[PDB]
Design an enzyme around this catalytic site. Sequence first.
Site, PDB file in Angstrom:
ATOM      1  N   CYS A   1      -0.960 -11.459 -49.749  1.00 46.84           N
ATOM      2  CA  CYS A   1      -0.234 -10.388 -50.432  1.00 46.84           C
ATOM      3  C   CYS A   1       0.129  -9.237 -49.488  1.00 46.84           C
ATOM      4  O   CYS A   1      -0.746  -8.499 -49.023  1.00 46.84           O
ATOM      5  CB  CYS A   1      -1.060  -9.900 -51.633  1.00 46.84           C
ATOM      6  SG  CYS A   1      -0.658  -8.271 -52.321  1.00 46.84           S
TER       7      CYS A   1
ATOM      8  N   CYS B   1      -0.722  -5.641 -50.546  1.00 48.04           N
ATOM      9  CA  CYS B   1      -2.175  -5.515 -50.435  1.00 48.04           C
ATOM     10  C   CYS B   1      -2.606  -5.093 -49.028  1.00 48.04           C
ATOM     11  O   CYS B   1      -3.534  -4.297 -48.871  1.00 48.04           O
ATOM     12  CB  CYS B   1      -2.852  -6.828 -50.827  1.00 48.04           C
ATOM     13  SG  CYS B   1      -2.477  -7.388 -52.505  1.00 48.04           S
TER      14      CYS B   1
END
Length: 111
Positions: A35, A38
Amino acid sequence: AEVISVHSLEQWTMQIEEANTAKKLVVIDFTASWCGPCRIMAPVFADLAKKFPNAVFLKVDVDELKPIAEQFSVEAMPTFLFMKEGDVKDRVVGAIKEELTAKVGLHAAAQ
Protein backbone atom coordinates in the site's frame (compact mmCIF):
# COMPACT_ATOMS: atom_id res chain seq x y z
CA ALA A 1 8.17 6.74 22.32
CA GLU A 2 7.97 4.20 19.49
CA VAL A 3 5.32 2.64 17.25
CA ILE A 4 4.69 -0.93 18.42
CA SER A 5 4.31 -3.42 15.58
CA VAL A 6 1.86 -6.20 16.45
CA HIS A 7 2.56 -9.50 14.66
CA SER A 8 0.29 -11.99 16.46
CA LEU A 9 -3.09 -12.28 18.17
CA GLU A 10 -1.19 -12.78 21.44
CA GLN A 11 0.71 -9.50 20.91
CA TRP A 12 -2.54 -7.68 20.05
CA THR A 13 -4.22 -9.01 23.19
CA MET A 14 -1.27 -8.02 25.41
CA GLN A 15 -1.02 -4.48 24.01
CA ILE A 16 -4.77 -3.84 24.26
CA GLU A 17 -5.20 -5.27 27.77
CA GLU A 18 -2.17 -3.32 29.09
CA ALA A 19 -3.42 -0.09 27.49
CA ASN A 20 -6.93 -0.65 28.89
CA THR A 21 -5.56 -1.26 32.41
CA ALA A 22 -3.55 1.98 32.17
CA LYS A 23 -6.68 3.67 30.71
CA LYS A 24 -4.73 5.14 27.79
CA LEU A 25 -5.69 5.99 24.22
CA VAL A 26 -4.73 3.44 21.57
CA VAL A 27 -4.17 4.56 17.99
CA ILE A 28 -3.84 1.73 15.46
CA ASP A 29 -2.43 2.11 11.96
CA PHE A 30 -4.01 -0.61 9.82
CA THR A 31 -1.48 -1.00 7.03
CA ALA A 32 -0.23 -3.15 4.16
CA SER A 33 3.24 -3.63 2.63
CA TRP A 34 1.93 -3.17 -0.93
CA CYS A 35 0.00 0.00 0.00
CA GLY A 36 1.58 3.23 -1.30
CA PRO A 37 -0.39 5.70 0.89
CA CYS A 38 0.53 3.49 3.88
CA ARG A 39 4.25 4.05 3.16
CA ILE A 40 3.64 7.82 2.93
CA MET A 41 1.91 7.83 6.35
CA ALA A 42 4.49 5.67 8.16
CA PRO A 43 6.79 8.63 9.09
CA VAL A 44 3.76 10.81 9.99
CA PHE A 45 2.45 8.09 12.32
CA ALA A 46 5.91 7.52 13.87
CA ASP A 47 6.33 11.27 14.45
CA LEU A 48 2.97 11.47 16.26
CA ALA A 49 3.95 8.52 18.47
CA LYS A 50 7.01 10.46 19.70
CA LYS A 51 4.90 13.60 20.28
CA PHE A 52 2.29 11.73 22.33
CA PRO A 53 4.03 9.28 24.73
CA ASN A 54 0.90 8.98 26.92
CA ALA A 55 -0.92 7.17 24.10
CA VAL A 56 -0.05 3.78 22.60
CA PHE A 57 0.57 3.70 18.84
CA LEU A 58 0.14 0.28 17.22
CA LYS A 59 0.85 -0.97 13.71
CA VAL A 60 -1.20 -3.85 12.29
CA ASP A 61 -0.64 -5.51 8.91
CA VAL A 62 -4.09 -6.44 7.55
CA ASP A 63 -2.66 -9.47 5.71
CA GLU A 64 -0.85 -10.68 8.85
CA LEU A 65 -3.67 -10.25 11.39
CA LYS A 66 -6.87 -10.76 9.41
CA PRO A 67 -9.16 -11.34 12.44
CA ILE A 68 -8.22 -7.89 13.81
CA ALA A 69 -8.74 -6.17 10.44
CA GLU A 70 -12.08 -8.02 10.08
CA GLN A 71 -13.14 -7.16 13.65
CA PHE A 72 -13.11 -3.44 12.80
CA SER A 73 -14.27 -3.84 9.17
CA VAL A 74 -11.00 -2.53 7.72
CA GLU A 75 -10.96 -2.79 3.91
CA ALA A 76 -9.53 0.65 3.14
CA MET A 77 -5.87 1.42 3.86
CA PRO A 78 -4.40 3.14 5.67
CA THR A 79 -7.06 3.17 8.37
CA PHE A 80 -6.18 4.85 11.67
CA LEU A 81 -8.43 3.63 14.46
CA PHE A 82 -8.81 5.38 17.82
CA MET A 83 -9.80 3.26 20.82
CA LYS A 84 -9.97 3.85 24.57
CA GLU A 85 -11.14 1.41 27.26
CA GLY A 86 -12.83 -0.88 24.72
CA ASP A 87 -14.65 1.85 22.78
CA VAL A 88 -13.86 3.10 19.29
CA LYS A 89 -13.47 6.89 19.53
CA ASP A 90 -12.61 7.84 15.94
CA ARG A 91 -11.36 6.67 12.52
CA VAL A 92 -9.19 8.28 9.83
CA VAL A 93 -9.26 6.67 6.39
CA GLY A 94 -6.59 7.41 3.79
CA ALA A 95 -3.37 9.43 3.73
CA ILE A 96 -4.90 12.54 5.33
CA LYS A 97 -2.02 13.98 7.37
CA GLU A 98 -3.91 16.99 8.76
CA GLU A 99 -6.94 14.96 9.92
CA LEU A 100 -4.80 12.30 11.64
CA THR A 101 -2.75 14.98 13.43
CA ALA A 102 -5.84 16.90 14.59
CA LYS A 103 -7.62 13.77 15.87
CA VAL A 104 -4.57 12.51 17.78
CA GLY A 105 -4.34 15.93 19.47
CA LEU A 106 -8.04 15.80 20.33
CA HIS A 107 -8.11 12.29 21.79
CA ALA A 108 -4.70 12.14 23.54
CA ALA A 109 -5.37 15.10 25.86
CA ALA A 110 -6.92 14.86 29.34
CA GLN A 111 -10.62 14.03 29.08
